[PDB]
Amino acid sequence: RGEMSRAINVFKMRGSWHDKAIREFMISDKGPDIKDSFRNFERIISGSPTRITVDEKSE
Amino acid sequence: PARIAIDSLSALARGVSNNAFRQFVIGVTGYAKQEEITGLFTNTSDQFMGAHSITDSHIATITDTIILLQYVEIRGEMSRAINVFKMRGSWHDKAIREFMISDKGPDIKDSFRNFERIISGSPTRITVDEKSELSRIVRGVQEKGPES
Amino acid sequence: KLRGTSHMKGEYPFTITDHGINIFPLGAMRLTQRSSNVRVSSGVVRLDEMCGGGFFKDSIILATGATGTGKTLL
Amino acid sequence: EHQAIAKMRTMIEGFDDISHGGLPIGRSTLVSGTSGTGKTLFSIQFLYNGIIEFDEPGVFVTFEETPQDIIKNARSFGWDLAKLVDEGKLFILDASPDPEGQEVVGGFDLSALIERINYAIQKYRARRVSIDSVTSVFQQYDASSVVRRELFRLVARLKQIGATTVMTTERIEEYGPIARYGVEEFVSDNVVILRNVLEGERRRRTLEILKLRGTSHMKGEYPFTITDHGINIFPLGAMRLTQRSSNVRVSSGVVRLDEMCGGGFFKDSIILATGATGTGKTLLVSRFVENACANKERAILFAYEESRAQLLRNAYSWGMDFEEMERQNLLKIVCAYPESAGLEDHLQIIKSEINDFKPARIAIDSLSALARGVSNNAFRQFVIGVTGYAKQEEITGLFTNTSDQFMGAHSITDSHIATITDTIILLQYVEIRGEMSRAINVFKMRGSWHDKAIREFMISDKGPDIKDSFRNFERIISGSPTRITVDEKSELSRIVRGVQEKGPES
Ligand SMILES: Nc1ncnc2c1ncn2[C@@H]1O[C@H](COP(=O)(O)OP(=O)(O)OP(=O)(O)O)[C@@H](O)[C@H]1O
Ligand SMILES: Nc1ncnc2c1ncn2[C@@H]1O[C@H](COP(=O)(O)OP(=O)(O)OP(=O)(O)O)[C@@H](O)[C@H]1O
Ligand SMILES: Nc1ncnc2c1ncn2[C@@H]1O[C@H](COP(=O)(O)OP(=O)(O)OP(=O)(O)O)[C@@H](O)[C@H]1O
Ligand SMILES: [Mg+2]
Ligand SMILES: [Mg+2]
Ligand SMILES: [Mg+2]
Ligand SMILES: [Mg+2]
Ligand SMILES: [Mg+2]
Ligand SMILES: [Mg+2]
């Protein structure tokens, strides 16, 4: 929506299992605040997303 | 040995020329084909997602069977996928199947069938009224059958 | 040059080891690689089906993919 | 022939063309070159043929090598010089110093040698003369000044006599000064440089005619090979463009494809099969070779990727038994590594087998296999070679090119050879529904009309199955196509309910 938002992700860890989602986060005076993923978007990695706004199953 | 594996030849190509490498491959490839040895070579394609080539220095062809893993972005998540690209003497599965990674190993689930442009890492979800056609409401031609 | 006869032309890498000079005629080795229809597992069941039975014993299997995909695993 | 300088033939596979005829009669040609380059053979080869082809006795002066050895060595190419030095056709004139020699002797002896050689030439009635390693004579205590005068005397007198002479010169650097005393180059009438350039740990020898006072000739380097038969040159550029073309048609071994090509490949035509790794190329080629033998015609297969054994395993699995093919003496499999020699050689190995077997068809699986390491021009020039040879010989060719980038390769050349080729066959993957399906296409056919669809094909134990086209898909070539449907359910065989039978009975 016209705003440079972030996104943290644990790309690879040889031992552990790590999270496979791309979670956005933000920076305040309290430090980083990881948030929720972009479940509803597409091409996320590319950088310039593309919401899917799928019309449900159309009833 | 009866089996031989070198993890990350892409770890050898470090600095060394392209030709010196290519040669080295043949050197470890041929010697393995003659000595009745089964070999698996690990290669790390410099770029995750989008990779138009599956090697680096173009070793590809000097091989029998290709096994490919590629990151697929889905619903805001980075999930793997595998595919047997080419097998010179066998049949091998054409489909591209995704897979989990736990404490047990690899579980080759299904294939993103309701998807497009997968090889790009970032696919295009395209269910939007699946193979049932606009006839999900069966028109109404089926209003003759049940009577009294 | 080897006056009178023939020879392999060019450079060839050799390694002076604890067993004297050892030259690898990387070009000499011929392309006479015995083959057969024998297959062997991988350690991944389904995967073996995906090949159609298992990798051939006499072959070279290539595993590519981005860092993290899990080639070391396979 | 329009030239004003009379020439005599060396009968050296290649030279007489590059020299537009052969060494200028009554003159001296300086064939110079690095250590082991080819020099002294040329010389010997030059006297040889004159003997065994024109019956012209020759005089060979040795300076460093022992008159015994020259004969001992020349046996490698299969020549009993002995017998000739014996029948009075070849007079070897020793001048090699001695194992218990003094020091100082290269000026008045240079005057004596003239008279010497002048005796044997008058005696044996010779036409050709070789003076191998003059250099060694000055390697006693001399400098540029005394070498141009002394050589000159020798050649000057030699020309007066009427002998067509060849002198040999050594040189430390491959491209730098032509000869040691950087003076021989202007004292001679002609100058034949022989090199053996390194680069990429491999070795490439070439011959070049810098100058031929009086006539024209082919300029620049030309690769040659020293085989069991001696010097062998390739005027890759003297290869005129006047091959024969015919509307005759042959099979591809794949029926449906044939249609797709207007009615079967042209007899005289180069064929290119490009497609990402694992697309199929190797197969087709095998099905091409096969059929050629199924009609009783010869054909060769030069595998640079897969072994002769494996070529059969996968060949049998696809049906078609190569075991028999070999036995019925109809198909010959070469099979080798592109790293086991320089192209010059590889180009000749192929040519050879094409003359000791006379194929009527040929297939080179993975030209791109030969493009490894090598420079594009070097490889492009080699392609023109094979392509060249097979074209002027009515031998149908099917080359295999594997593009370095599956799905998304904006160019099926990579090395840009698609314009020398007559007919291209394209194989490429197609991402349809989480599945890597294949699909072939006939890009171009110079004489035929060929089908313009990008049909899909499947591989079975039986072979290449050419199905139907992805009409309802855009961005095909892109590799991962976009499904846009105007139909699909459109007739073809609607009729719902029970349409099939099963395995019991129909
Ligand atoms: N115990 C585990 N549980 C869940 N996931 C794991 C576990 N171990 C590893 N993984 C996952 O598998 C990946 C490990 O990669 P792996 O060791 O298979 O080699 P690779 O991908 O071929 O090469 P490299 O490790 O150098 O990137 C990690 O990135 C991670 O996502
Ligand atoms: N039968 C043969 N097959 C292949 N190569 C051969 C054969 N016989 C000789 N050669 C090659 O020929 C070359 C010998 O060179 P040659 O005797 O023609 O004179 P030169 O190289 O000009 O001068 P010099 O006496 O200083 O070496 C070597 O490089 C050698 O490998
Ligand atoms: N018996 C078989 N049954 C089914 N499919 C086969 C069989 N043999 C080979 N294949 C298929 O054919 C392909 C093998 O490629 P092929 O040997 O035709 O040469 P290529 O693709 O031109 O070059 P290269 O194999 O060196 O990459 C594989 O990708 C595989 O899917
Ligand atoms: Mg291949
Ligand atoms: Mg890695
Ligand atoms: Mg690793
Ligand atoms: Mg020498
Ligand atoms: Mg010599
Ligand atoms: Mg192949």
Residue numbers in the entry:
A (entry chain B): 446 to 504
B (entry chain A): 372 to 519
C (entry chain A): 224 to 297
D (entry chain F): 14 to 519
What's the paper's own text on this?
To analyze the phosphorylation patterns of KaiC P-site mutants and to visualize potential conformational variations in the vicinity of bound ATP and residues 432 and 431 at hexamer subunit interfaces, we determined crystal structures of the S. elongatus KaiC single mutants T432A (TSa), S431A (TaT), S431D (TdT), and T426N (nST) and the double mutants T426A/T432A (aSa) and S431A/T432E (Tae). b KaiC mutations xyz or mutants KaiCxyz are sequentially shown in order of sites x = 426, y = 431, and z = 432 where the wild-type residue is in upper case and mutated residues are shown in lower case, i.e. Tsa or KaiCTSa, where the residue at position 426 is T, the residue at position 431 is S, and the residue at position 432 is mutated to A. The crystal structures of the KaiCTaT and KaiCTae mutants are noteworthy in two respects. The structures of the Tae and TaT mutants reveal that T426 residues in some of the six subunits carry a phosphate group and call into question the common assumption of just two P-sites in the core clock protein. Among the structures of the six KaiC mutant proteins reported here, those of the TaT and Tae mutants are the most intriguing because they imply that T426 can be a third phosphorylation site. Therefore, phosphorylation at T426 seen in selected subunits of the Tae and TaT mutants is most likely not a crystallographic artifact. Rather the crystal structures have preserved a third P-site in KaiCII that appears to have evaded identification by other approaches. The T426 phosphorylation site is not a substitute for S431 as demonstrated by the arhythmic behavior of the TaT and aST mutants.
The circadian clock of the cyanobacterium Synechococcus elongatus can be reconstituted in vitro by three proteins, KaiA, KaiB and KaiC. Homo-hexameric KaiC displays kinase, phosphatase and ATPase activities; KaiA enhances KaiC phosphorylation and KaiB antagonizes KaiA. The crystal structure of KaiC from S. elongatus revealed a hexamer in the shape of a double doughnut with approximate dimensions 100×100 Å, whereby the N-terminal CI and C-terminal CII halves of subunits are joined by a 15-amino acid linker. Two phosphorylation sites (P-sites), T432 and S431 that are both located in the CII half were identified in KaiC.
